[PDB]
């Protein structure tokens, strides 16, 4: 605003008008300077108003260009995270058994529901009470999915280790059911 020469033009016109007024300039001269002051003031506000649009306009650009810049910066991070997740999950695959089962497929396509059931190397069984425990996985080894598994760990709801001997009918109330038992494929 003040930077533009319109401010200086208005200031000098106003100064001349005041000097003429205090100097007792004639009415014809007085009107001339006042009219000159008006047009000088007219330009001063005319280019002043456009500034409001300008700095206003710039702010949205910054906010917009902040936002667009902000988004892409976040886009790369999430893309890298997703790629890392995919590759880490890949490295967990049992390539041998997976290949053996998938090659047996006539069309090379198999239902997903059997991918773990025929290749997963670790079995988790969640048991609500002692009767189901005894029915399903009594002993240090058991059978499921037409395969043999051996118990390697047993934990309670609190993620506290539990010894197999502790899982007894009389000791059942003292255990924080349900039990998560983890076994391996043999």
């Amino acid at each position: 605003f003040s930077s533009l020469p319109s401010y200086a033009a208005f200031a000098t016109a106003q100064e001349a008008y005041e000097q003429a007024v205090a100097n007792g300039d004639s009415e014809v001269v007085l009107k001339k300077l006042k009219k000159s002051l008006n047009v000088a003031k007219s330009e001063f506000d005319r280019d002043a108003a456009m500034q409001r649009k300008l700095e206003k306009m710039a702010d949205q650009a910054m906010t917009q260009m902040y936002k667009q810049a902000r988004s892409e910066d976040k886009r790369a991070k999430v893309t890298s995270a997703m790629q890392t997740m995919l590759f880490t999950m890949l490295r967990k695959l049992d390539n041998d058994a997976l290949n053996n089962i998938i090659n047996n497929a006539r069309d090379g396509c198999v239902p997903l529901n059997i991918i773990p059931l025929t290749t997963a190397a670790k079995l988790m069984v969640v048991i609500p009470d002692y009767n189901t425990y005894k029915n399903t996985c009594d002993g240090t080894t058991f059978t499921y999915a037409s395969a043999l598994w051996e118990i390697q760990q047993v934990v309670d709801a609190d993620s506290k280790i539990v010894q197999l001997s502790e899982i007894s009918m009389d000791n059942s109330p003292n255990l924080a059911w349900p039990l998560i038992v983890t076994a391996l494929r043999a």
Binding site: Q64, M65, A69, E72, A76
Partner: protein, 590 residues
């Protein structure tokens, strides 16, 4: 995506779309560049163009922003204003963009095409951030230049050990050696794909190639060969970490009963453990490779990373280490593509091993205790930055001789790159001198060794030997045919075979030439084992025959001549053209 200004590191989001690399530039630096250079295309988060329904204006100073878009003067709204004003370019962090006068050199760095030698020398004396950008854009220029290459395909199935070449008409051909590989492409009907990459060498006569097979998938005429171009990734790490010397060796624990073989270098070895990065230089055939294993044995319980630009040098170091170092605790890192006949003698590709060998290109991002870079002469600043980035070690050991040959530097066609500006390491070594040196030699006769020491070196070599009196240097014209991408001298071999009947000594000699075409041809009429000049530098011999084909700067290269003549031990018959070279060395006249 925001970044840092190249020449002032200030936060910015502006890129010079005209520059090949589109490097980041701040408001002030960007204005200085656009107003200074002819580059008038600049990329913010969005390109700076006239977003009119129909219009195409790319100049930035002629662009004004209106509404939420950019236009020229003829499509702007009633509202202002210029994008390029107030000594700044409109963008992010407008109030933290510091300008620098370094734009003067930045303009030359960006605008040059690397045709002349001045670019390289000025591309090496610039600051670190400009150094990285210059290296990146130079490599990009190299790759783009490689995109203009001659493509070929196999004529038909001729031999299992050798194919034939059918190139396109109107395009050049590349040099044929291990460095240059090519990719077969399978566009038959039917799904252009890859089956394997081949390396080619000139055939026997006319048109033919003796090749190297990567994949056993044999190809019909449905495929054709290209020079396997690729892209270039950006770099962040410095060419050389700051030189910070040490008081007493840290992280490197000396050994017990190291050896009697190389106890003379113990001081050097501790000095190798002293500087953060150490620079050792030794003339052709002086055990710097031997020095590497010596250092490795000096610190037994430290993880050591061997690095070299090419497969040949790293493979030689691997073999020597297998010979001396324990063989079990080794891990040679192999590229997944395997575009070369790889080295599989250790327990290969174990990145979590003590003694890990790798090439510059295939280094995975890891950490170590000490890393030894070898053959820095052929190494480029890009390689230096890459090794600085991917690898972090407590100690660095750059071993190499700038008196050797340079990197290919194909784009350089006018001017000669002197040793001082091969790269940052070579400049350092030619500036303050190598941190270490070993000047003992045991191979060449007395007159030759003395004269060679007199040519370029400062008279510090002597042979613990007497001249075998079988070293010669003649003046044979050897009329030149050179009707192939490299020069040939067959009648020179005729003049030689006029000899070789009165001198039964070197009847098991190795032929060497400064042109690979003569190297290929000389093995055809006579079955002399062949070894080009590059394939030397690491082996010693007693009967070698070297022949000079042309007369030019490439022929008078004292480095090439030195590496050529220092490989024989008792006998070498030479074909030589220039009296200038003839008056520096003493030989029998015959």
């Amino acid at each position: 995506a925001v970044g840092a200004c190249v020449l002032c590191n200030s936060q910015t989001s502006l890129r010079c779309g005209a520059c090949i690399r589109r490097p980041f530039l701040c408001c002030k630096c960007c204005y200085d560049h656009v107003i200074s250079t002819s580059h008038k295309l600049v990329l913010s988060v969005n390109p700076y163009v006239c977003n009119a329904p129909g219009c195409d204006v790319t100049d930035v100073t002629q662009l004004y922003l209106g509404g939420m878009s950019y236009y020229c003067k003829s499509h702007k709204p009633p509202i202002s204003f210029p994008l390029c004003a107030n000594g700044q370019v409109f963008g992010l962090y407008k109030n933290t963009c510091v300008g620098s006068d370094n734009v003067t050199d930045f303009n030359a760095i960006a605008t040059c095409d690397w045709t002349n030698a001045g670019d390289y020398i000025l591309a090496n004396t610039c600051t670190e951030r400009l150094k990285l950008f210059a290296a990146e854009t130079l490599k990009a220029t190299e790759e783009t230049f490689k995109l203009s290459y001659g493509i070929a395909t196999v004529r038909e199935v001729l031999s299992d050990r050798e194919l034939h070449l059918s190139w396109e008409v109107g395009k050049p051909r590349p040099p044929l050696n291990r460095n240059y590989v090519f990719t077969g492409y399978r566009v038959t009907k039917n799904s252009k794909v890859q089956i394997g990459e081949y390396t080619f060498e000139k055939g026997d006569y006319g048109d033919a190639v003796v090749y190297r097979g990567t994949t056993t998938y044999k190809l019909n005429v449905g495929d054709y060969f290209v020079l396997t171009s690729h892209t270039v990734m950006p770099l962040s790490a410095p060419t050389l970490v700051p030189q910070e010397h040490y008081v007493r060796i840290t992280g490197l624990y000396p050994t017990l009963n190291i050896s009697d073989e190389f106890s003379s270098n113990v001081a050097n070895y501790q000095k190798v453990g002293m500087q953060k990065y150490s620079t050792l230089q030794g003339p052709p055939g002086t055990g710097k490779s031997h020095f590497a294993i010596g250092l490795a044995l000096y610190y037994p319980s430290a993880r050591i990373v061997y690095t070299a630009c090419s497969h040949a040098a790293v493979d030689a170091l691997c073999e020597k280490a297998l010979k001396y170092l324990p063989i079990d605790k080794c891990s040679r890192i192999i590229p997944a593509r395997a575009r070369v006949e790889c080295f599989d003698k250790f327990k290969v590709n174990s990145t979590l091993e003590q003694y890990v060998f790798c090439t510059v290109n295939a280094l995975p991002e890891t950490t170590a205790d000490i890393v030894v870079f070898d053959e820095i002469s052929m190494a480029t600043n890009y390689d230096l930055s890459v090794v600085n980035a991917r690898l972090r070690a407590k100690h660095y050991v750059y071993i190499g001789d700038p008196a050797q040959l340079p990197a290919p530097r194909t784009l350089l066609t006018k001017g000669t790159l002197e040793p001082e500006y091969f790269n940052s390491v070579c400049r350092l070594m030619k500036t303050i001198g190598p941190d270490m040196f070993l000047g003992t030699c045991r191979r060449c006769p007395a007159e030759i060794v003395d004269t060679v020491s007199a040519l370029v070196y400062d008279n510090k070599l002597k042979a613990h030997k007497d001249k075998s009196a079988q070293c010669f240097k003649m003046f044979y014209k050897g009329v030149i045919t050179h009707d192939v991408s490299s020069a040939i001298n067959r009648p020179q071999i005729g003049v030689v075979r006029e000899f070789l009947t009165r001198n039964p000594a070197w009847r098991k000699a190795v032929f060497i030439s400064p042109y690979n075409s003569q190297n290929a041809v000389a093995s055809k009429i006579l079955g002399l084992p062949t070894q080009t000049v590059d394939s030397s530098q690491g082996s010693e011999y007693d009967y070698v025959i070297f022949t000079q084909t042309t007369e030019t700067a490439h022929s008078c290269n004292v480095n090439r001549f030195n590496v050529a003549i220092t490989r024989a031990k008792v006998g070498i018959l030479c074909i030589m053209s220039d009296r200038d070279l003839y008056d520096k060395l003493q030989f029998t006249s015959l």
